[PDB]
Paper text:
ABCC4 (ATP-binding cassette sub-family C member 4) is a transporter protein that is primarily localized to the plasma membrane, and its efflux activity is associated with the progression of various cancers and the development of drug resistance. ABCC4 can transport a diverse range of substrates, and its involvement in numerous vital cellular physiological processes has been well documented.
The hABCC4-Apo structure was used to illustrate the substrate-binding pocket of hABCC4 and the state of the pocket in the absence of substrate binding. On the basis of the analytical structural data, the resolved hABCC4 protein exhibited an average resolution of 3.29 Å. Comparison of the density maps of the substrate-binding pocket between hABCC4 (Apo) and the other three complex structures clearly reveals the density of the substrate molecules within the binding pocket in the three complex structures. Helices TM2, TM3, TM5, TM6, TM9, and TM11 collectively form an approximately elliptical cavity surrounding the periphery, whereas helix TM12 traverses the central axis of the cavity. In the top-down view, the binding region appears as a fan-shaped pocket. The outer ring of the pocket is surrounded by residues F156, F211, F324, L363, L367, F368, and R946, whereas the center of the pocket contains residues Q994, W995, and R998 located in helix TM12.
Residue numbers in the entry: 8 to 396, 696 to 746, 756 to 1206, 1211 to 1262
The structure:
């Protein structure tokens, strides 16, 4: 078999995941697909994880049968996993306690500088001991975390597999009555949505008791440093939840209304794409163009609001750590106390450690727990049933379509001001402390030191709001101006492009790509640039204090790109394997659920169970590698993330003779915040690169084949169609520009006021005659019509003066006046008379409006004969001479036949039909053989 290297692995070697190096060396050049992966542990099989849980559930229900109660499911899970829960509780408690000693010892390190005696060597050893003790908390938080995390992630796949196994085992013991109420889709949804929520609960499970405990532990430390003023720092930290709740409940309605706005546009686009030939033959593009541009305008107007709202939310979240500090220190100074460089940075670090933790971990845990509880409830109620008896060009083309270069210069200038204010606000406090420590009465005026502080506080908020608003506007305008180009380019493609591509593809494109361009790109781009700027500023303020940190950063900067490449060259394969191993189990379940009686007939039912287990083992095996390949990177990242802090701390301590307390405190208070921002910045790039494919495939359009322009410079006479004699020459027709031919030298002569019939074998090139007269594809040879040709005339000047009766009618979703008159050029009485003389008036009088009747599902209220009659009404209302009647039916018809035989004023009627009983007493007839056409003068000669 395939023995995994996880077993037989000593300690101090699986903390760095050293047993995964060879696998990468295989995935560097060979692109391993499926046969070079490791199997699962012997204690991770489906049967071993399902049998014990089934036994525990049976024991629990047998115990609950005694009392007059209902058996529960969460008790059976607790009684099985309480050991693992209690084992992980110790480590999560240790990790939560290890985040409090760091500020307490940073305070002592700074206090050593506050009382500095050069003629001493005893306090330096104690300072070195403080630094050594501070060095261990970082190592515990950065190294020993990526193993507990892997274990707490692996502790959920077992529960998921057990639930799936027991659900499938129960599903094969249902009766006919119990099977009649449930459906296959219901079971598929219950297995693909309810169970899959058991992988993100164990991660956010320890944030219900360790959340408030850390807050209470931090709230009591500040009383021993600054006093009552610390409460001022906690009053602002509460308003964030009511601030975000209203934002969410206001954004939901905007999302709903913009969705209900774009749904109609999607439907109209689907209607337009299907049936492009009739629309192109009738020259009815402007109506749909306007109907689409109006809905697009409304959709953009509704999206701008939510965009601005989310931008304001991000701007408010970016600068919440400044108001708290400003308020608490203003209150602390206004009482009468004096500022010190050892009590400010400790409070800053504690605030930064509590606010992000609470506001990012507590709100999500409640939602996760509620979802898990409702899923467990659903699965419990189910189991109680009866039984039986890209490139840089892709970015340039997307950015240069939003504004000029001066706007980009202004945005670059505005990006580097909020961060400068963010850093200067902190530097001002260190300057204050240094100026205070130089005293030897002679107090300091508060006006200057408070006014400058308030100004530096306000500037940050202003420059944080303006940048976000500008970025969101610029990035929405690009999609707004790109959709129009896409639609205008696709509204002029030939039929050749339309017949070689399905409708579902283009519809899914127009929906999903525009959704992605309007929903997820600006948020991700703003988050990425903000998180990158924060890290750049942190590194800059760390280097500006010690000019020697710039030397080791280059070796710590070259390896990062190489590691990123070496990981991404092989990390883009596990998701594909996960998908192609998750699909077959669903396929097997769907195929085996319907074929139930064939399994109960034969005395073999456990074979399907073994097959299901063997199918799920492959998915478990393909999923096992995902967690390890994900955790193999965080260790190498946190290594540098902690080495930087160690280096800066020991370098600041070694050079204790040429600096002071304020600047060393400022330098050390920033190094303890690099981890989360580093992780977010290195993570968002993957999503950006994955989402750029939408832009890639959108720019794929707008550069396609283009037919002849709609109009030329030369204009036809005001009344061109008159005595519509039509001649031909040696003409050759073809569908592809370099493909085979379908006609061979069609030359005839059709005079005026003649009924020319065409009789030929189907599929031998009979319907290819109408596509040559309407020049849907440029043919070969001259086609003279009314003393002029058909090539030097525009398409709209040609297709307008002719009429064609399609083989099958089509009705567009709209009113009654639109389907008969999209361009308002005729009166209402004229249309009423034309509809009366076609013998159809009673079908519309019974309707309420009789003139503005809305039709559902392309006119589902009318019959086929009414469709032929309304097409005839359209043809009569057009009132042209050249009329092409093509019809092939198998079926009301006698009246339309006699009408088209009498109503039309004998204007060059030609027919393309196969029914010989319709070509009777025609002026001229033509016969089609497999390649050519033969014209007969009189039909009496043939008969």
């Amino acid at each position: 078999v395939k023995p995994n290297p996880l077993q037989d692995a000593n300690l101090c070697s699986r903390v760095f995941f050293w047993w995964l190096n060879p696998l990468f060396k295989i995935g560097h050049k060979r692109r391993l697909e499926e046969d070079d992966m490791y199997s699962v542990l012997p204690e991770d099989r489906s049967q071993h994880l399902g049998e014990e849980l089934q036994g525990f559930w049976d024991k629990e229900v047998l115990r609950a049968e005694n009392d007059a109660q209902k058996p529960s499911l969460t008790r059976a899970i607790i009684k099985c996993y309480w050991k693992s829960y209690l084992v992980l509780g110790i480590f999560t408690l240790i990790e939560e306690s290890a985040k409090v000693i760091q500020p307490i010892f940073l305070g002592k390190i700074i206090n050593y500088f506050e009382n500095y005696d050069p003629m001493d060597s005893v306090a330096l050893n104690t300072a070195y001991a403080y630094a050594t003790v501070l060095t261990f908390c970082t190592l515990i938080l950065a190294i020993l975390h990526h193993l507990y995390f892997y274990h707490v992630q692996c502790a959920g796949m077992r529960l998921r597999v057990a639930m799936c196994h027991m659900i499938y085992r129960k599903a094969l013991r249902l009766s006919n009555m119990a099977m009649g109420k449930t459906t296959t889709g219901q079971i598929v949804n219950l297995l693909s949505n309810d169970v899959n929520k058991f992988d993100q609960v164990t991660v956010f499970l320890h944030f219900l008791w360790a959340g408030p405990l850390q807050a209470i532990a931090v709230t009591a430390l500040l009383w021993m440093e600054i006093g009552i003023s610390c409460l001022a720092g906690m009053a602002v930290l509460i308003i964030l939840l009511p601030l975000q709740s209203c934002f969410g409940k206001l954004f939901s309605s905007l999302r709903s209304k913009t969705a209900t706005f774009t749904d109609a546009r999607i439907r109209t686009m689907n209607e337009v794409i299907t049936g492009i030939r009739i629309i192109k033959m009738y020259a009815w593009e402007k109506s749909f163009s306007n109907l689409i541009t109006n809905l697009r305008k409304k959709e953009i107007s509704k999206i701008l609001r939510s965009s601005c709202l989310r931008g304001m939310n991000l701007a408010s979240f970016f600068s919440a750590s400044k108001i708290i500090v400003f308020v608490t220190f203003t209150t602390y100074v206004l009482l009468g106390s004096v500022i010190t460089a050892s009590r400010v940075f400790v409070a800053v670090t504690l605030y930064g450690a509590v606010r992000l933790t609470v506001t990012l971990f507590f709100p999500s845990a409640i939602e996760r727990v509620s979802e898990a509880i409702v899923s467990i409830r659903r699965i419990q109620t189910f189991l109680l049933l009866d039984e039986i008896s890209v490139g840089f060009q892709a970015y340039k083309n997307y950015f240069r379509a939003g504004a000029h270069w001066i706007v980009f210069i202004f945005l670059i200038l505005l990006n580097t001001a909020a961060q400068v204010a963010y850093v200067l606000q902190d530097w001002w406090l260190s300057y204050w402390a240094n100026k205070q420590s130089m005293l030897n009465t002679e107090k300091l005026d508060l006006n200057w030191y408070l006014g400058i502080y308030s100004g530096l506080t306000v500037a940050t908020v202003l420059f944080g709001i303006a940048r976000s608003l500008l970025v969101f506007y610029v990035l929405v305008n690009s999609s707004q101006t790109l959709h129009n180009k896409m639609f205008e380019s696709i509204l002029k493609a030939p039929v050749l492009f339309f017949d070689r591509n399905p409708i579902g593809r283009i519809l899914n494109r127009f929906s999903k790509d525009i959704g992605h361009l309007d929903d997820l790109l600006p948020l991700t781009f703003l988050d990425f640039i903000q998180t990158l700027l924060q890290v750049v500023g942190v590194v800059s303020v760390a280097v500006a204090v010690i000019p020697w940190i710039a030397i080791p950063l280059v070796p710590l900067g070259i390896i990062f790109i190489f590691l990123r490449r070496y990981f991404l060259e092989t990390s883009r394969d596990v998701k594909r394997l996960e998908s192609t191993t998750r699909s077959p189990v669903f396929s097997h379940l769907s195929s085996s659920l319907q074929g139930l009686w064939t399994i109960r007939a034969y005395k073999a039912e456990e074979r399907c169970q073994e097959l299901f287990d063997a199918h799920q083992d492959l998915h478990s095996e393909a999923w096992f590698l995902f967690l390890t390949t994900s955790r193999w990177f965080a260790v190498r990242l946190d290594a540098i993330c902690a080495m930087f802090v160690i280096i800066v701390a020991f370098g600041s301590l070694i050079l204790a003779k040429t600096l002071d307390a304020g600047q060393v405190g400022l330098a050390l208070s920033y190094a303890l915040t690099l981890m989360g921002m580093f992780q977010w910045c290195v993570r968002q790039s993957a999503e950006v690169e994955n989402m750029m494919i939408s832009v890639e495939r959108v720019i794929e359009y707008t550069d396609l084949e283009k037919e002849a322009p709609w109009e030329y410079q030369k204009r036809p006479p005001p009344a061109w169609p008159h005595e519509g004699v039509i001649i031909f020459d040696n003409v050759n027709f073809m569908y592809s520009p370099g493909g085979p031919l379908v006609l061979k030298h069609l030359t005839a002569l059709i005079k005026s006021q003649e009924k020319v019939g065409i009789v030929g074998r189907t599929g031998a090139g009979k319907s290819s005659l109408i596509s040559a007269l309407f020049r849907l594809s440029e043919p070969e040879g001259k086609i003279w019509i009314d003393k002029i040709l058909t090539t030097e005339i525009g398409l709209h000047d040609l297709r307008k003066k002719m009429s064609i009766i399609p083989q099958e009618p089509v009705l567009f979703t709209g009113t009654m006046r639109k389907n008969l008159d999209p361009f308002n050029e005729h009166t209402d009485e004229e249309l009423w008379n034309a509809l009366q003389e076609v013998q159809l008036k009673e079908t519309i009088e019974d309707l309420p409006g009789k003139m503005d009747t809305e039709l559902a599902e392309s006119g589902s209220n009318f019959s086929v004969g009414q469709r032929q009659l309304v097409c005839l009404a359209r043809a009569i209302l057009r009132k042209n001479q050249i009329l092409i009647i093509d019809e092939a039916t198998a079926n009301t018809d006698e009246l339309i036949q006699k009408k088209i035989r009498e109503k039309f004023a004998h204007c060059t009627v030609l027919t393309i039909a196969h029914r010989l009983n319709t070509i009777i007493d025609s002026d001229k007839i033509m016969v089609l053989d497999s390649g050519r056409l033969k014209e007969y003068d009189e039909p009496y000669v043939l008969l």
